[PDB]
């Protein structure tokens, strides 16, 4: 059946009701918001607010309370509204049908937590992680990965078709010295696949030679020209270096549970040729100091698309990239998950793209999802540079250390030696990030994100186990619960079970908002809000003598399951893999 965006529903029935009360008005505000207080109803409509101000005139100000009246007067029949109240000025407070909420709570237990999805299959392309080959994958790359994996999942769950592209820096000029060095240190690479160790100790070996030996430097620069010329021997040496890089990288994408089509800058070697010609032939190119540059009317900087020496650039690659994503992949939306240091870069690229006619931003969504830098607690850059695998190993350890109080004796081997340990570590590292606005800088603290209390993954993961233990400890297997759900009316007479009930149905309205601003932290803020609504429900209501059985209220067994299902999905979107026991 799939869940209902209640906010979008109330917006439909108010726009019907507003068109009736003021049909001569054009595009009136349909600001419907959840009431975050018991008395004011379950949703609020602040629409007589902006409607009064549209009718405002030099010497006449229509009082909003009289509008709200004229609005409620024409409210159609529905399936979700009990009564309507007017407070203050023209606030319209809305009360939901208990029946409606109950029926909806049920529907997601039998049909399950799934979204309605679309009437057209749009194609979202998400550009994330993107480390630079031969250089360490750094924490800023980590954010992108985490944020990108989660964004990809939100659209995947929303019914979109999603292309996860790892746009890796595998076409740098630094390959020159690596390849030239590889040919020195391992003169049989063509035949004996060379044992290159740590790619960082190798790179170091090169930049020394580069900065030291002048005849080596020239060789290095020549290798780049030869590589771009697609030379057989030189290219093989390149493939082999990216190979050693690729398998160290997968160790990380594996641990963080991340799927990615690798499609580096090198993928566009030929399109770049055509792009340069395509900008030339439309007269957008200007020659400055031997560079072919492009000025975009409005932008603070120019794109360099050919250097003085014939070599392409980041701008060249990202121009080729957006043309093919728009034309061959035929995307309806493109998302770039890249550190905010490069904000200007994408606004100029996107501009350049409109300028040459590649897309109509009214029609195709192109979006830079930016993020702040990673800091230590001393509120400056995060360094020691930190290897990502080290960070995670140091996460796994710490996660384990916590668990030794004293759960190594309760949970069995699997439930703990992985399940709880890993699900907590990786879960915290993702959650600490996503729970904070992606734009603000991020303070990476093992101590803060591993805290057993507060707004951490740790608390919410533990919290999850308790919701699951309830119907477990009272011995009600899945088979029973599914039959209960199919036959039980769900009861919401008690205040705190009404809070929890409508909090639950807010899941769609939450995710929709995130499809528009890509602010995932409002989902974490929702998992915490849901999680807290539950405790307040549990601490007063009974689900389950002073001898054994305190009777089972089967409908509250289902409430617990509703809460569980929705947290389960919310976790999945965020990239958290919850355990049951811990
Ligand atoms: N420009 C695109 N498509 N992705 O960003 C690439 C990130 C780059 N490799 C870096 O090191 O920042």
Swiss-Prot record:
This is Arginine--tRNA ligase, cytoplasmic. GO terms for biological process: arginyl-tRNA aminoacylation; tRNA aminoacylation for protein translation. GO terms for cellular component: aminoacyl-tRNA synthetase multienzyme complex; cytoplasm; cytosol; extracellular exosome; membrane; nucleolus; nucleoplasm; nucleus. Gene3D superfamilies: Arginyl tRNA synthetase N-terminal domain (3.30.1360.70), HUPs (3.40.50.620), Isoleucyl-tRNA Synthetase, Domain 1 (1.10.730.10). It comes from Homo sapiens. It holds the Pfam family tRNA-synt_1d. Interacts (via N-terminus) with AIMP1 (via N-terminus); this stimulates its catalytic activity. Interacts (via N-terminus) with LARS2 (via C-terminus). Monomer. Part of a multisubunit complex that groups tRNA ligases for Arg (RARS1), Asp (DARS1), Gln (QARS1), Ile (IARS1), Leu (LARS1), Lys (KARS1), Met (MARS1) the bifunctional ligase for Glu and Pro (EPRS1) and the auxiliary subunits AIMP1/p43, AIMP2/p38 and EEF1E1/p18. Interacts with QARS1. Part of a complex composed of RARS1, QARS1 and AIMP1. It catalyses: tRNA(Arg) + L-arginine + ATP = L-arginyl-tRNA(Arg) + AMP + diphosphate. The alpha-helical N-terminus (residues 1-72) mediates interaction with AIMP1 and thereby contributes to the assembly of the multisynthetase complex.
């Amino acid at each position: 059946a799939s869940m209902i965006n209640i906010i979008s529903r109330l917006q439909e029935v108010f726009g019907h009701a507003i068109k009736a009360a003021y049909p001569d008005l054009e595009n009136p505000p349909l600001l419907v918001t959840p009431s975050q207080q018991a008395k004011f109803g379950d949703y609020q409509c602040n629409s007589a607010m902006g409607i009064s101000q549209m009718l405002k005139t030099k010497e006449q100000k229509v009082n909003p309370r009289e509008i709200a009246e004229n609005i409620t007067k024409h409210l159609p029949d529905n399936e979700c509204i009990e009564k309507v109240e007017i407070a203050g000025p023209g606030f319209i407070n809305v009360h939901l049908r208990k029946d409606f909420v109950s029926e909806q709570l049920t529907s997601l237990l039998v049909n399950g937590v799934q979204l309605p999805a679309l009437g057209e299959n749009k194609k979202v392309i998400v550009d994330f992680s993107s480390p630079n080959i031969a250089k360490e994958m750094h924490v800023g790359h980590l954010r992108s990965t985490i944020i990108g994996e989660s964004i990809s999942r939100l659209f995947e769950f929303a019914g979109y078709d999603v292309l996860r592209l790892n746009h890796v820096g595998d076409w740098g000029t630094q390959f020159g010295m690596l390849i030239a060095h590889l040919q020195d240190k391992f003169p049989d690479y063509l035949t004996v696949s060379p044992p290159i160790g740590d790619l960082q100790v190798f790179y170091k070996e090169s930049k020394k030679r580069f900065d030291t030996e002048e005849e080596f430097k020239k060789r290095a620069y020549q290798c780049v020209v030869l590589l771009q010329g697609k030379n057989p021997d030189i290219t093989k040496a390149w493939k082999l270096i990216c190979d050693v890089s690729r398998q160290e990288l997968n160790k990380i994408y594996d641990a963080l549970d991340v799927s990615l089509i690798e499609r580096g800058e090198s993928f566009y070697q030929d399109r770049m040729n055509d792009i340069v010609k395509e900008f030339e032939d439309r007269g957008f190119v200007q020659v400055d100091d031997g560079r072919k540059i492009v000025f975009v009317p409005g932008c603070s900087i120019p794109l360099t698309i050919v250097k003085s020496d014939g070599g392409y650039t980041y701008d060249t690659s990202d121009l080729a990239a957006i043309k093919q994503r728009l034309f061959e992949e035929k995307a309806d939306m493109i998302i770039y998950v890249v550190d905010n240091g490069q904000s200007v870069h994408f606004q100029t690229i996107f501009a350049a793209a409109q300028m040459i006619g590649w897309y109509d931003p009214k029609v195709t969504r192109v979006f830079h999802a930016g993020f702040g830098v990673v800091l230590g607690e001393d509120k400056k850059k995060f360094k020691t540079t930190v290897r990502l695998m080290d960070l995670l190993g140091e996460g796994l350890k710490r996660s384990m250390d916590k668990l030794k109080e004293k759960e190594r004796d309760k949970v069995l081997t699997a439930e703990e030696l992985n399940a709880a340990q890993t699900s907590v570590a990786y879960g915290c590292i993702k959650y600490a990030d996503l729970s904070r606005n992606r734009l603000n800088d991020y303070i990476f603290s093992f101590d803060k994100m591993l805290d057993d209390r507060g707004n951490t993954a740790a608390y919410l993961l533990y919290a999850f186990t308790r919701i699951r233990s309830i119907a477990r400890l009272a011995n009600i297997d899945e088979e029973m619960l599914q039959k209960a759900a199919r036959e039980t009316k769900i009861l919401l007479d008690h205040e705190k079970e009404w809070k929890l009930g409508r909090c639950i149905l807010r899941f769609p309205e939450i995710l929709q908002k995130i499809l528009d601003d890509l602010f995932l932290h409002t989902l974490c803020d929702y998992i915490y809000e849901l999680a807290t609504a539950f405790t307040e429900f549990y601490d007063s209501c009974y689900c389950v003598d002073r001898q054994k059985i305190l009777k089972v209220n089967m409908w509250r067994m289902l409430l617990c399951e509703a809460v569980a299902a929705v947290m389960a999905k919310g976790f999945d979107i965020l990239g958290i893999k919850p355990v049951q026991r811990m």
